[PDB]
Write a protein that binds this ligand. Structure first.
Ligand SMILES: [Mg+2]
Ligand SMILES: [Mg+2]
Ligand SMILES: [Zn+2]
Lengths: 305, 154, 294, 166, 110, 50, 149
């Protein structure tokens, strides 16, 4: 009848033992999935036109300036992919939709703060619980066996991706901050009217139209940015350098996938399909994958023609 | 919008906020244990923590003397800080104070708290203690620890 | 021979007949001055009824906090069952799970769970098969699981329970916990217990050795629902005390040629010491390993 | 005024034959003229309604409302005379049956307003009533299950007749 | 703005007796292991905290009486001594406070 | 508005009627026995020896 | 109104009249004042009619109590336990006789709204209608759009 937490009845000699025990198990579980191509992988099919592959979940680290051989400066958001895995696969018929779906998670968190149903679901999967889970629409040939890890090498430089995340919340806000209303003049007789919405509707209808711009909560909603290209990829730290800014605050989880813009369709011909497998790769990728236009930090200073 | 704002708006303003914290700190120095509203105790805790760090610098350091002069309204406490508190915590690098929650005061049902310097001469507070190692849950986990310990060494 | 459904009926009738006899020989109403010795509310004196009142009744006199928390009663320094009637005026102390040294409480809980798990053994198997329990080893708490010694029919020589069979045992125990049967104790003469368990050779051996070590030659019998077992030492008041229950696995002792011994094992945790799902999972893995006494 | 609650403790039932079961003990207690709002005190009375005496005391001890301590003393003295004068064996074997608040006698004072206006303020007083019944609190009514909905719907369908005919 | 019509008691009951308007039952109440009085899990026990303050007040009263004047804070450590007690081997050069009482059981001597 | 309660009650028992009065309370019986009689020990056995 | 008044179905007492008719009136009690203008109609009624009424109805017991009163009353009891009390305050003789005769014919049931002007325990002799009453049966009773074997 009383609530409880994991370390409520633990003595002083037991708390460190439990903390390291779960930590060791979590690391062991994560390291056991480092060879997906040897643990009976699902069949791999060649890329075909009209095929959609799975995406990624990353953490927003920050931004740095980036220059090109042309001489222009572009800002890039640091998206780091950590502990990203495929959880479960749902076929097209089961998911009663036009395309099959795939479940992906990332950013493993403590097991002591998860529901019983979620904990047992991860127990059979043999992976630590993830913070967020996203669903990606894929085709039949793009199926990936559950438990397969994913890395930032799944994308390549010169590829346009889409990022979706919850925006920075701002709480209850007025019309000026929320909808950019012009407000009222601050002087010349104005009485208690400097940020008021003013008229909300016409008098004849005798009501307020639904969807009217009114003061209320702002942010903490899911927004997606389209047409963002990848300038650089760091193989060692699994970091993607997406162009421009992305929604969400620092250290927030952002779902990444291939761009849906019509002008960017049929561009996954050379991209890894269904994903990149470092264990089964014949060669080792370089430390950093740059763009053709990106000037390397170690390259000599650019002299224009 | 208050993101990253690590200072509470208390008192009549920034000047009053410092003065209120200073008075609480002075009483904490003199009496070694005071009770105050929970929010004010938490805010003052950081200033109390840093006082010993300035006290450890030595009285001959002119920066610490000026800081102690401002933050101690009663001048008799400055010799105490530089010759009692600082020598007591010379081996301790942090956590000089412990803060606990006490039942709300009857005047206005405000959230009350008590903050005191460790190693005081006052009678000990009824500090909350974790479960004993002899209980059923602890014994079962202890047995798991031993069996796991014997498994890895063999 | 006698069917199991009638064996329980006569054993219950004998238990009721003995309980009535103990009440009958007791006089009508006598007052015993029971003094409360403890760190909480000291100096309280309880004037209760001999062989009628219980340490639980004294607990209700103070508050429900004692009733809910006190798992064991300490009479004159020796452990006492919560529902066991008092026989004389004496000092009383109550013990909880979260005490400085809850060694007796843990041991009482350990034996209490053995009987509950031992009880569902008879009801689990088919009516055609025969099940005869041996005894309840006093396995230490630190072993990680409590064990009970059972012997099965000659048909199940190579039969080993699967996951579903162990799941069914847990479901029956949880229903037993759900029914919330209080633990009833009765101190009886050795000869009376012998005729109660005359159909079990192992229980007869257990009764005769318990009487041998006891100068008065009397043994204590505990009853849950319609089930009566010979247990040594006080138990917890009711079956609702335990919250998390599970039987770990089944192990076969050696040698098996003279007699087949099956050591069923399980682990439990009460409501007051509820654990997280992850922590409980590790305890289940540890409890599955076989354990033997020193 | 009316003071029927106090007289409810003076009614005596005839002795019971052994055939009929035990009549549970009941105690009527009330405190009059409390400087509190009856609406505000209603929330505390409803909160501890139906719970055990000792559980109610624990809930009332840590409540920040002023009326909480008033009821706490009322419950405490109600438990005292129950064991002492009402043949109650166990003082913890009691549960709250009914707890409610009633409007007491109130004064009328003038509250000054601007422009020479005024408003009639009222110094609210209220009573608190409580009845304690010996025995464990009754179990709460379980939620009505889906099968209960199923049989009830069947009963309505089976209870319909041909109307406006023979 | 003024109300247009009088609100009925049926509407008022639906608002005043709303579930969120009711007082929520507290499930963080437990008995103190030492004195047996009720306390919260995250809050110090009222009985034990108050008895420490009274002893602290008595010692502080002895502090001021031996002090005998403001702005005279000692530059040495302080140790309180009860009846039938002597200075310890490590208790040297520190201000001694004499309490005309027996040392409490909970007041463990260092 | 100035209306208040009639709370003028002073605690009053029944101890002494006003003095210097010819009328006084008439007593029908004494408070206690004039001389205490100590029952001899063993009177229960004397009951058998009727 | 009907929504504010309880109703009942049309019925009799023990199927009265099925084999024989049993008079439902069982007892009559009359209160008459010797002096007083309010009892004059009641007084003259019993001088000339209560004798003839008694002979007409032998199964009904009539009690005539003469006590001081301001409102003469008559109380009628039936075998079902229903009790009816009617005042005789200042009425004539030809109208009390009609009033008294009316109580004799009454069955004693509550005079409230009757839901149905008819009642029968066997509304049908050929069977009540059911959805399959006018439904033909096909060969082997095959359901629509299904095949067998
Ligand atoms: Mg925010
Ligand atoms: Mg004026
Ligand atoms: Zn305490």
């Amino acid at each position: 009848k009383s609530g409880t937490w994991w370390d409520e009845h633990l003595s002083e000699e037991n708390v460190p033992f439990i903390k390291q025990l779960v930590s060791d198990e979590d690391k062991a579980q994560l390291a056991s999935k480092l060879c997906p191509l040897k643990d009976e992988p699902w069949p791999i099919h060649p890329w075909e036109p009209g095929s959609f592959r799975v995406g990624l979940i990353a953490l927003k680290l920050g931004m740095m300036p980036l220059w090109t051989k042309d001489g222009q400066k572009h800002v890039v958001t640091l998206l780091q992919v950590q502990d990203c895995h495929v959880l479960k696969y749902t076929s097209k018929e089961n998911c009663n939709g036009k395309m099959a779906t795939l479940s992906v998670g990332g950013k493993t968190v403590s097991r002591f703060r998860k529901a019983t149903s979620i904990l047992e679901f991860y127990r059979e999967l043999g992976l630590p619980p993830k913070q967020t889970v996203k669903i990606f629409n894929i085709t039949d040939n793009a199926a990936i066996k559950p438990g397969t890890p994913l890395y930032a090498a799944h994308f390549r430089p010169g590829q346009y991706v889409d990022v979706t995340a919850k925006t920075i919340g701002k709480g209850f806000q007025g019309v000026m901050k929320r909808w950019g209303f012009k407000g009222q003049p601050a002087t010349h007789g104005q009485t208690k009217t400097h940020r008021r919405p003013g008229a909300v509707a016409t008098g004849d209808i005798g009501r307020v139209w639904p969807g009217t711009k009114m003061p209320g909560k702002m942010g903490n909603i899911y927004r997606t940015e389209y047409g963002l290209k990848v300038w650089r990829i760091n193989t060692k730290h699994n970091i993607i350098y997406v162009n421009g800014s992305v929604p969400g605050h620092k250290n927030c989880l952002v779902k990444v996938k291939d761009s849906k813009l019509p002008a960017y369709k049929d561009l996954g011909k050379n991209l890894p399909f269904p994903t990149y497998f470092p264990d089964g790769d014949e060669e080792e990728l370089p430390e950093d994958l740059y763009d053709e236009n990106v000037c390397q930090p170690g390259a000599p200073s650019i002299t224009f023609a | 919008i208050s993101h990253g704002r690590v200072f509470r708006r208390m008192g009549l303003g920034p000047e009053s906020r410092i003065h209120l914290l200073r008075n609480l700190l002075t009483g904490l120095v003199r009496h070694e244990r005071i009770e105050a509203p929970w929010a004010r105790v938490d805010e003052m805790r950081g200033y109390a923590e840093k006082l010993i760090d300035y006290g450890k610098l030595g009285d001959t350091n002119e920066r610490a003397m000026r800081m102690a002069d401002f933050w101690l309204t009663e001048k008799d406490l400055i010799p105490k800080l530089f010759q009692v508190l600082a020598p007591r915590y010379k081996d301790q690098t942090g956590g000089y104070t412990r803060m606990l929650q006490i039942p709300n005061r009857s005047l206005d049902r405000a959230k009350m708290a008590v903050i005191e310097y460790k190693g005081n001469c006052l009678p000990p507070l009824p500090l909350p203690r974790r479960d004993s190692h002899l209980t059923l849950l602890n014994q079962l986990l202890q047995g798991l620890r031993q069996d796991l310990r014997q498994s890895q060494e063999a | 021979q006698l069917s199991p459904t009638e064996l329980t009926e006569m054993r219950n009738d004998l238990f009721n007949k003995e309980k009535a006899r103990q009440l009958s020989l007791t006089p009508r109403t006598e007052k015993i001055e029971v003094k409360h010795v403890g760190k909480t509310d000291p100096g309280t004196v309880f004037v209760m009824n001999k062989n009628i009142s219980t340490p639980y009744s004294c607990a209700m006199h103070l508050s429900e906090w004692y009733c809910r928390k006190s798992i064991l009663a300490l009479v004159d320094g020796q452990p006492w069952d919560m529902y066991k009637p008092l026989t004389k005026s004496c000092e009383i102390k109550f013990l909880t799970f979260k005490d400085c040294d809850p060694g007796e409480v843990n041991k009482a809980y350990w034996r209490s769970c053995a009987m509950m798990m031992g009880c569902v053994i008879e009801r689990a198997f088919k009516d055609e098969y025969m099940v005869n329990l041996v005894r309840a080893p006093e396995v230490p708490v630190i072993s990680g699981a409590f064990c009970y010694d059972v012997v099965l029919d000659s048909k199940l020589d190579e039969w080993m329970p699967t996951k579903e069979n162990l799941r069914s045992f847990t479901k029956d125990a949880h229903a037993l916990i759900y029914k919330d049967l209080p633990f009833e104790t009765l101190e009886v003469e050795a000869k009376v217990a012998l005729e109660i368990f005359q159909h079990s050779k192992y229980k007869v051996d257990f009764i005769e050795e318990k009487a041998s070590q006891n100068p008065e030659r009397i043994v204590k019998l505990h009853r849950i629902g319609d089930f009566i077992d010979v247990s040594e030492g006080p138990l917890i008041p009711r079956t609702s005390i335990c919250f998390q229950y599970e039987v770990s696995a089944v192990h076969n002792l050696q040698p098996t040629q003279p007699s087949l011994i099956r050591r069923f094992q399980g682990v439990s945790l009460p409501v007051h010491l509820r654990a997280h799902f992850t922590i409980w999972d590790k305890l289940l893995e540890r409890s599955r390993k076989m354990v033997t006494e020193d | 005024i009316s003071r029927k609650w106090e007289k409810k403790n003076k009614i005596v039932y005839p002795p019971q034959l052994p055939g009929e079961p035990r009549r549970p003990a009941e105690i009527y207690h009330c405190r009059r003229q409390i400087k509190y709002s009856k609406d505000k005190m209603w929330y505390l009375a409803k909160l501890i309604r139906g719970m055990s005496i000792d559980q109610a005391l624990a809930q009332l001890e840590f409540n920040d409302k002023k009326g909480a301590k008033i009821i706490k003393e009322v419950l405490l003295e109600a438990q005292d005379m129950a064991v002492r004068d009402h043949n109650v064996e166990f003082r913890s074997n009691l549960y709250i049956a009914e707890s409610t608040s009633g409007r007491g006698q109130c004064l009328k004072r003038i509250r000054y307003h601007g422009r020479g206006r005024f408003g009639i303020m009222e110094k609210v007083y209220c009573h608190y009533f409580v009845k304690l019944v010996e025995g464990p609190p009754p179990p709460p009514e379980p939620p009505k299950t889906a099968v209960a909905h199923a049989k009830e719907y069947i009963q309505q369908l089976r209870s319909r007749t041909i109307v406006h005919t023979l | 703005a003024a109300p247009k019509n009088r609100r009925t008691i049926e509407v008022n009951r639906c608002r005043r007796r709303n579930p969120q308007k009711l007082i929520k039952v507290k499930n963080n109440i437990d008995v103190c292991p030492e004195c047996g009085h009720l306390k919260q899990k995250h809050v110090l026990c009222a009985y034990c905290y108050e008895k420490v303050c009274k002893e602290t007040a008595e010692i502080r009263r002895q502090i001021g009486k031996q002090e005998g004047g403001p702005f005279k804070a000692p530059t040495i450590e302080t140790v309180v001594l009860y009846t039938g007690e002597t200075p310890s081997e490590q208790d040297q050069g520190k201000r001694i406070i004499e309490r005309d009482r027996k040392r409490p059981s909970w007041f463990t001597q260092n | 508005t100035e209306k208040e309660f009639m709370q003028h009650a002073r605690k009053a028992g029944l101890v002494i009627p006003p003095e210097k009065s010819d009328r006084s309370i008439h007593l029908a019986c004494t408070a206690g026995i004039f001389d205490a009689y100590v029952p001899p020990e063993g009177d229960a056995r004397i009951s058998s020896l009727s | 109104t009907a929504r504010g008044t309880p109703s009942r179905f049309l019925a009799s007492v023990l199927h009265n009249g099925l084999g024989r008719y049993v008079q439902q009136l069982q007892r009559l009690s009359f209160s008459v004042s010797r002096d007083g203008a309010s009892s004059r109609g009641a007084r003259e009624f019993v001088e000339r009619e209560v004798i003839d009424f008694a002979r007409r109805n032998p199964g009904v017991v009539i009690y005539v109590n003469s006590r001081p009163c301001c409102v003469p009353r008559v109380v009628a009891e039936y075998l079902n336990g229903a009790v009816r009390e009617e005042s005789i305050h200042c009425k004539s003789v030809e109208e009390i006789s009609t009033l008294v005769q009316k109580l004799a014919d009454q069955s004693g049931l509550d005079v409230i709204r009757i839901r149905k002007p008819f009642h029968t325990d066997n509304p049908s002799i050929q069977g009540q209608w059911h959805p399959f009453t006018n439904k033909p049966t096909t060969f082997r009773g095959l359901r629509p759009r299904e095949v067998q074997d």
